[PDB]
Structure 1
Amino acid sequence: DPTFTERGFSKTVKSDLIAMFKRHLLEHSFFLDRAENMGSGFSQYVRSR
């Protein structure tokens, strides 16, 4: 997603992208375990991912 990047590869953009990695390791990996326990939005969730 070039929103974060292509602004100038400083210490700061990568030092924020590390916390982005830490936040996305929890809510968007092993999505099938979410979708087998999620509500009625089964198919649209997998299509989104």
Structure 2
Amino acid sequence: PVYSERGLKKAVKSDMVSMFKAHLIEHSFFLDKAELMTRGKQYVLTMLS
């Protein structure tokens, strides 16, 4: 809820839109990325939980 506290005016809505973008790129298909990692279990757990 911290990203929506001030209220959905015009500047907060569009900043949400470009916040989907960087999250759609990195944190999607997250299991497939987790086979090529140093850390491993603390990526899926930081994704799931």
Could you tell me the percent identity over the aligned residues? Answer: 57
Q: Which stretches in structure 1 are left out of the alignment for 5+ residues?
A: none
- TM-score by length of structure 1 reads 0.84
The structural deviation recorded for 1:9 is 1.0
- TM-score by length of structure 2 reads 0.84
- Following TM superposition, where does structure 1 have runs of at least 4 consecutive aligned residues deviating by more than 4 angstroms? none
- RMSD, aligned CA: 0.9
Q: Which stretches in structure 2 are left out of the alignment for 5+ residues?
A: none
